PDB file of C-alpha atoms in Angstrom:
ATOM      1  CA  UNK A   1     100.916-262.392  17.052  1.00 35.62           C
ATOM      2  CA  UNK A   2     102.270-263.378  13.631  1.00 35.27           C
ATOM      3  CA  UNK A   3     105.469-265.196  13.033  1.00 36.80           C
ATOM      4  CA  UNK A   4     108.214-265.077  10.366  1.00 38.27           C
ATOM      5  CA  UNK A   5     109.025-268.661  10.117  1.00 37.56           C
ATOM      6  CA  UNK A   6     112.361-268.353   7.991  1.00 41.84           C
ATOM      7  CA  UNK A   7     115.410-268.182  10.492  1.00 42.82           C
ATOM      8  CA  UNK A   8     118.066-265.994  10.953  1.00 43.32           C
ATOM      9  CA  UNK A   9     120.617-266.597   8.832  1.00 42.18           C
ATOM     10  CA  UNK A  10     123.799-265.217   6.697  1.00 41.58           C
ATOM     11  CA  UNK A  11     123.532-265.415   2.552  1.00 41.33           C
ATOM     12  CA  UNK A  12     127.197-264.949   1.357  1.00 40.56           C
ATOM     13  CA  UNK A  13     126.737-264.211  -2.831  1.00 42.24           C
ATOM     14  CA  UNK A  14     129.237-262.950  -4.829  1.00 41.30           C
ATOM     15  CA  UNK A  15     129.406-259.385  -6.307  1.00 41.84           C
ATOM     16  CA  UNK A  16     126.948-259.174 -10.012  1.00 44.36           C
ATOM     17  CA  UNK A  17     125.240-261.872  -8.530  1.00 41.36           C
ATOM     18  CA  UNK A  18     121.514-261.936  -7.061  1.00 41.28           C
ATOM     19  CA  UNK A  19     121.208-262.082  -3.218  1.00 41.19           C
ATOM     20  CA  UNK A  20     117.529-263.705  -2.165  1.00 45.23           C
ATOM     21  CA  UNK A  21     116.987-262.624   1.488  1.00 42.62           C
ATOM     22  CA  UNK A  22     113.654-265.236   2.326  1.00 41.60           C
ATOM     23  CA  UNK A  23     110.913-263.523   4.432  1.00 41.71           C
ATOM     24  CA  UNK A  24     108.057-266.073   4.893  1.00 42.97           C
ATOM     25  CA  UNK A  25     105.077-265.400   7.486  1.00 44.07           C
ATOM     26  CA  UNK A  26     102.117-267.138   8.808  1.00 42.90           C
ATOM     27  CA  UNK A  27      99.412-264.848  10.337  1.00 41.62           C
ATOM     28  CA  UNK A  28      97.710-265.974  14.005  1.00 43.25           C
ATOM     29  CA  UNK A  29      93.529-265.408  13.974  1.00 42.36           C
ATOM     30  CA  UNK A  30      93.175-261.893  14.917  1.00 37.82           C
ATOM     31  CA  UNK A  31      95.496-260.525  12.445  1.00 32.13           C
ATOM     32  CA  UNK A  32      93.070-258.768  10.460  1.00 29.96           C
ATOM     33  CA  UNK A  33      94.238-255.297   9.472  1.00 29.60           C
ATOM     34  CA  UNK A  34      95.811-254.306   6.540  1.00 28.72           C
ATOM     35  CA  UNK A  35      99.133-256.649   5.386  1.00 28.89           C
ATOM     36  CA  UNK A  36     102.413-254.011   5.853  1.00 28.86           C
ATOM     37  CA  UNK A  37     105.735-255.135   4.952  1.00 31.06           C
ATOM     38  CA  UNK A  38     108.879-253.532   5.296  1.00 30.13           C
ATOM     39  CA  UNK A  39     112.869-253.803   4.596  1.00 28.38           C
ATOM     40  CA  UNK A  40     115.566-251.662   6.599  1.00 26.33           C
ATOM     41  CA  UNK A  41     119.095-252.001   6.040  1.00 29.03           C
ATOM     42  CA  UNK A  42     121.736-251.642   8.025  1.00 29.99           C
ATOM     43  CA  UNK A  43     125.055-251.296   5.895  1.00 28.58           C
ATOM     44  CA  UNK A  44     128.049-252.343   7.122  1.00 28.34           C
ATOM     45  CA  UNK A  45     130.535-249.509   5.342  1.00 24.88           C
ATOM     46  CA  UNK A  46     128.411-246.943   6.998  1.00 23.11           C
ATOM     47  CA  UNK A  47     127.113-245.858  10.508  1.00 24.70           C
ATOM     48  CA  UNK A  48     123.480-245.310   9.305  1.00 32.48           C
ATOM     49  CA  UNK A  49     120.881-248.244  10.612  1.00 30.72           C
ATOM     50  CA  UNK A  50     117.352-249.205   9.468  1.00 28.97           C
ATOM     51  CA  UNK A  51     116.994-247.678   6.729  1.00 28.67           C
ATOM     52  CA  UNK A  52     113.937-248.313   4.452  1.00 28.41           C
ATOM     53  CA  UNK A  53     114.508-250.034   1.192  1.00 25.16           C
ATOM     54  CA  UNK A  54     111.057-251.441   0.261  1.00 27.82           C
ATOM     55  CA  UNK A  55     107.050-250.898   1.504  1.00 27.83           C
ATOM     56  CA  UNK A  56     104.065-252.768   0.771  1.00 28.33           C
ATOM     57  CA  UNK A  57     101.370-250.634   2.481  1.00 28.37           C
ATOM     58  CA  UNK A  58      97.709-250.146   1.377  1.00 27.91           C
ATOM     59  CA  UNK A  59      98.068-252.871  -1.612  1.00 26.59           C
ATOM     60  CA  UNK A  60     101.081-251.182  -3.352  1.00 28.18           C
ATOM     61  CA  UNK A  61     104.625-251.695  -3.598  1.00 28.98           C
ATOM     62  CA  UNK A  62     107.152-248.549  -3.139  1.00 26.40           C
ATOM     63  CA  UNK A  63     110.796-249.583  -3.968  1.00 24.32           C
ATOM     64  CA  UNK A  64     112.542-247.642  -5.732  1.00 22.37           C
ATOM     65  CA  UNK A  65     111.002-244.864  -4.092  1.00 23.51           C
ATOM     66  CA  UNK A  66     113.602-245.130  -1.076  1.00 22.21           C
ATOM     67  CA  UNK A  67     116.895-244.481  -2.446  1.00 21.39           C
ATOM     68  CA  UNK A  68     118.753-247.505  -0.355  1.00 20.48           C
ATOM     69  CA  UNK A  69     119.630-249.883  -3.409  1.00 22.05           C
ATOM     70  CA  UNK A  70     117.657-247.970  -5.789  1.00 18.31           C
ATOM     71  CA  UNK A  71     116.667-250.468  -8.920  1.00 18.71           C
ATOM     72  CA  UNK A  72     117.895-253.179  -7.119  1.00 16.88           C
ATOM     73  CA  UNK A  73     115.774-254.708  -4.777  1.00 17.09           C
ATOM     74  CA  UNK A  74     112.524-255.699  -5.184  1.00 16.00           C
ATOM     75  CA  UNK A  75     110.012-258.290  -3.972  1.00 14.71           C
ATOM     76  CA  UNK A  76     109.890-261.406  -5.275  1.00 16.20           C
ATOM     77  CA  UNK A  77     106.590-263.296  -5.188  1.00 18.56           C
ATOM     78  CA  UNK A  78     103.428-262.016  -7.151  1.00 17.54           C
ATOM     79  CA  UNK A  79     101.171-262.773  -4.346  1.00 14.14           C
ATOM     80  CA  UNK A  80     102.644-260.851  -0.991  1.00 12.86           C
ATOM     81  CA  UNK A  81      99.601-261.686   0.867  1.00 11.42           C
ATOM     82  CA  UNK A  82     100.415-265.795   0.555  1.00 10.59           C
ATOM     83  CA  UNK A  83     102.576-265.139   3.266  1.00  9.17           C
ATOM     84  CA  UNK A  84     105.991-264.270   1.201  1.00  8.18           C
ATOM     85  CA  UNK A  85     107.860-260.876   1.887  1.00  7.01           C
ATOM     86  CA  UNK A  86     110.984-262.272   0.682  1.00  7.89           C
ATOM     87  CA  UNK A  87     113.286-259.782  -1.885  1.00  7.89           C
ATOM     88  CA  UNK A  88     115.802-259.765  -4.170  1.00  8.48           C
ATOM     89  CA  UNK A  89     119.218-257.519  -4.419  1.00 11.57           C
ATOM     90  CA  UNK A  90     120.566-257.629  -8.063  1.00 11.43           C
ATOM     91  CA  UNK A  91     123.884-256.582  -9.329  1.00 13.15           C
ATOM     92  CA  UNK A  92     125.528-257.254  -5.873  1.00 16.21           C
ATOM     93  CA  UNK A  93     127.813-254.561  -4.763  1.00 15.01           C
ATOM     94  CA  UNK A  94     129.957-254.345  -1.820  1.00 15.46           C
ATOM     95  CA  UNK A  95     128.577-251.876  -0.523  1.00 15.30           C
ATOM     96  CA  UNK A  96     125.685-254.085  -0.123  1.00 17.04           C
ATOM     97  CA  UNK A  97     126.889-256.340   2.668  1.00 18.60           C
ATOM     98  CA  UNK A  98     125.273-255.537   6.014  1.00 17.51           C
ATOM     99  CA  UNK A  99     121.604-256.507   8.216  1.00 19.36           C
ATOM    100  CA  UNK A 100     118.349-256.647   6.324  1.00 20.90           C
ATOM    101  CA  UNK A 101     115.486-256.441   8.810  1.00 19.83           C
ATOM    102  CA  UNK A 102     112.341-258.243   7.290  1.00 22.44           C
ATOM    103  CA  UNK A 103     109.364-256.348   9.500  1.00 22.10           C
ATOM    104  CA  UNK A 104     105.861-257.499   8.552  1.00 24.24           C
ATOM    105  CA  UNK A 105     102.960-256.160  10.167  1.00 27.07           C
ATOM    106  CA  UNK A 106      99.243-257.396   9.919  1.00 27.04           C
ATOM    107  CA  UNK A 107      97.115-255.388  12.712  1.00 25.43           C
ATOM    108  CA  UNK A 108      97.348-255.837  15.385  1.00 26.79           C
ATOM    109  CA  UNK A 109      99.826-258.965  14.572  1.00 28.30           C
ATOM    110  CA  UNK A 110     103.898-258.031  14.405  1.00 29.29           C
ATOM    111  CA  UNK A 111     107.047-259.664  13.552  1.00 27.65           C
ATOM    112  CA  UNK A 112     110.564-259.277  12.144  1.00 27.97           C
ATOM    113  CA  UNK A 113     113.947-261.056  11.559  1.00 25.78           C
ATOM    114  CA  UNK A 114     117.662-260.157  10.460  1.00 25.57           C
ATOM    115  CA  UNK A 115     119.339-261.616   7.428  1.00 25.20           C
ATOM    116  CA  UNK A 116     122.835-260.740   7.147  1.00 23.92           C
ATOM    117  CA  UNK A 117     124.013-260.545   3.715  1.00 23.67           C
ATOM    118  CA  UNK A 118     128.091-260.798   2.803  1.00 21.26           C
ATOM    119  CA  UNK A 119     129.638-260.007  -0.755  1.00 24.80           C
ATOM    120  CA  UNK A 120     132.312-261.365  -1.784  1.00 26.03           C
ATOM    121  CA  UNK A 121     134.761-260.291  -4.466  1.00 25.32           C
TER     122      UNK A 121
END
């Protein structure tokens, strides 16, 4: 077991602006595989869902790799494995707003939460 112990919770911003979407975990005592993090999105202007925006898997970072908000998310915190998956979305568009699943993974422990980030003009 493993729990994300941010809550759900909408993050209006306005567009340019930086949205922080807060991912923070705590691991139970038999979580001892390899730390895994992942972002999907789910935009609102389209009908795709859970699409991958960001990986931390086998102690690197793919981001801009995954072409969801390309250059502009990232993770935030230098030290993942402290228990903070949280990102940031620069240069807020509107085509932005939508449901960011945090998923974090630390074998055989599993967890995940919605944001819902809103852009407004």
């Amino acid at each position: 077991s493993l729990s994300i112990t941010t809550p759900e919770e909408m993050i209006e911003k306005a567009k340019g602006e930086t949205a922080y979407l807060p991912c923070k975990f705590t691991l139970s005592p038999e979580d001892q595989g390899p730390l895994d993090i992942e972002w999907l999105i789910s935009p609102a202007d389209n009908q795709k869902v859970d699409q991958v925006i960001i990986l931390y898997s086998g102690d690197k970072i793919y981001d801009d790799y995954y072409p969801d908000l390309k250059g502009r998310v990232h993770f935030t915190s230098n030290d993942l494995k402290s228990g903070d998956a949280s990102i940031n979305v620069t240069n807020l568009q509107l085509s932005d707003i939508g449901t960011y699943q945090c998923k974090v993974k630390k074998a055989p422990g599993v967890a995940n939460k919605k944001i819902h980030l809103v852009v407004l003009v």
